[PDB]
């Protein structure tokens, strides 16, 4: 067995930068080295075979280098759609084994979130549950903080949030918060507010509605 080890597990660069990942095999694998790119969600895509053979289609900012047990993938001017994880593959002996991947993140200017809020659909209310949804759209960097408040009272449970992978075109993130009550509690109150902290904001931003 041949153990491939990639040498930055994670790295963030700026649009236009030159970026180099390193892959190192445990035995001489000659020039039998492959590079795959995996944008989040999608399946892997071959980018380079046999150390430096570009697959037609693959932009020419990508390049391969090395022989023996050290191999290098170079992105010469990083693009926003280069957000992905990259795996090397040794094609020398069975089983062809993969590297652990190098997450590659794009750095961009600060962007403050657009905060939205969605009351529960009357549809959902018929069944005796109320989910309230707050949307933080297209912000950067990633650290944001959502607090839910009911009649100006800090809520402390029945909260779940999710954040997207980084956007392929504008490098931002989006966050979706959900506050879920029984229909009983939802109608014991009037004011539902979403409170968002993010560094591109001077002070916390509150979006709210009246039940």
């Amino acid at each position: 067995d041949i153990q491939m080890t990639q040498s930055p597990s994670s790295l963030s660069a700026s649009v236009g930068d030159r970026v180099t990942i390193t892959c190192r095999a445990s035995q001489s694998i000659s020039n039998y080295l492959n590079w795959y790119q995996q944008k989040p969600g999608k399946a892997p895509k071959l980018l380079i075979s046999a150390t430096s053979s570009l697959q037609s289609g693959v932009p020419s900012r990508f390049s391969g280098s090395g022989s023996g047990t050290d191999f290098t993938l170079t992105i010469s001017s990083l693009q926003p759609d280069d957000f992905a994880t990259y795996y090397c593959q040794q094609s020398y002996s069975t089983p062809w084994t993969f590297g652990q991947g190098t997450k590659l993140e794009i750095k961009r200017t600060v962007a403050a979130p657009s905060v939205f809020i969605f009351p529960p659909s009357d549809e959902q209310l018929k069944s005796g549950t109320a989910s309230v949804v707050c949307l933080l759209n297209n912000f950067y960097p990633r650290e944001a903080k959502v607090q839910w408040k009911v009649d100006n009272a800090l809520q402390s449970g029945n909260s779940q949030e999710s954040v997207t992978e980084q956007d392929s075109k504008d490098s931002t993130y989006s966050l979706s918060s959900t506050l879920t009550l029984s229909k009983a509690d939802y109608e014991k109150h009037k004011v539902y507010a979403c409170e968002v902290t993010h560094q591109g904001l001077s002070s916390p931003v509150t979006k709210s509605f009246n039940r």
């Binding site: 492959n34 075979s49 949804v133 999710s162 709210s208």
Partner: protein, 224 residues
């Protein structure tokens, strides 16, 4: 042109077996290998084996002792992979790929075209399709002439669901978020899109929610 299309997601109980298809197009099926590789959610890719679409020869990975079976059907340009006696740690996305691995040993060896993937969840719990609620644009969803609207796909097992807007026609501005786990063990997600609030009464917005492990397929029209 050259595309591999895979069987949809499936939930199987511990100890059952699963069989995942993979149909080819736009290339000569008999003149390549087909390889399967699995990716456990969170950490990395693993070779399972490969099969000759010409000879039918198989080479399996050692760990999967006698649990994996790879076949091909020449007439249908389709390859199959069976995984018997399923374990809780078999949950992964299961890819097929076209592999070049000829009698001439050259360095042009690779997997290219991969199938989109099949998520196989192994669990003792029962499938549950989701309820789909609209997130309607209002003045509480307007920032500078741009409205936001969505769908709330709530209470399903297992993953995954897929959302589209206007049957694939609307894509710029869409966000489908990673699913959360509820206090109950049932997943939920939301899918939103930003549009010009001017064209709110003029455009129709429909979200197409497909959760194949329950063969459910809800369309919700989202309206102000």
């Amino acid at each position: 042109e050259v595309q591999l299309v895979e069987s949809g997601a499936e939930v199987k109980k511990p100890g059952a077996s699963v069989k995942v298809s993979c149909k080819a197009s736009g290339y000569t099926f008999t003149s390549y290998d087909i390889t399967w590789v699995r990716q456990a959610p969170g950490q990395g890719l693993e070779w399972m084996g490969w099969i000759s679409a010409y000879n039918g020869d198989t080479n399996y990975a050692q760990r999967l002792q006698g649990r994996v079976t790879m076949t091909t059907d020449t007439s249908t340009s389709t390859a199959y992979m069976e995984l018997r006696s399923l374990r809780s740690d078999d949950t992964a996305v299961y890819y097929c790929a076209r592999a070049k691995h000829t009698v001439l040993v050259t360095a042009m060896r690779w997997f290219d075209p991969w199938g989109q993937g099949t998520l196989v969840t192994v669990s003792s719990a029962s499938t549950k399709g989701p309820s789909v609620f609209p997130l309607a644009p209002s003045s509480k969803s307007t920032s500078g002439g741009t409205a936001a609207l969505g769908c709330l796909v709530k209470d399903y097992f297992p993953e995954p669901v897929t959302v589209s807007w206007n049957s694939g026609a609307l894509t710029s501005g869409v966000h489908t978020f990673p699913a959360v786990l509820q206090s109950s063990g049932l997943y939920s997600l939301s899918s939103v899109v930003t549009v010009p609030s001017s064209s709110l009464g003029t455009q129709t917005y429909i979200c197409n929610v497909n959760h194949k492990p329950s063969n459910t397929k809800v369309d919700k029209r989202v309206e102000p």
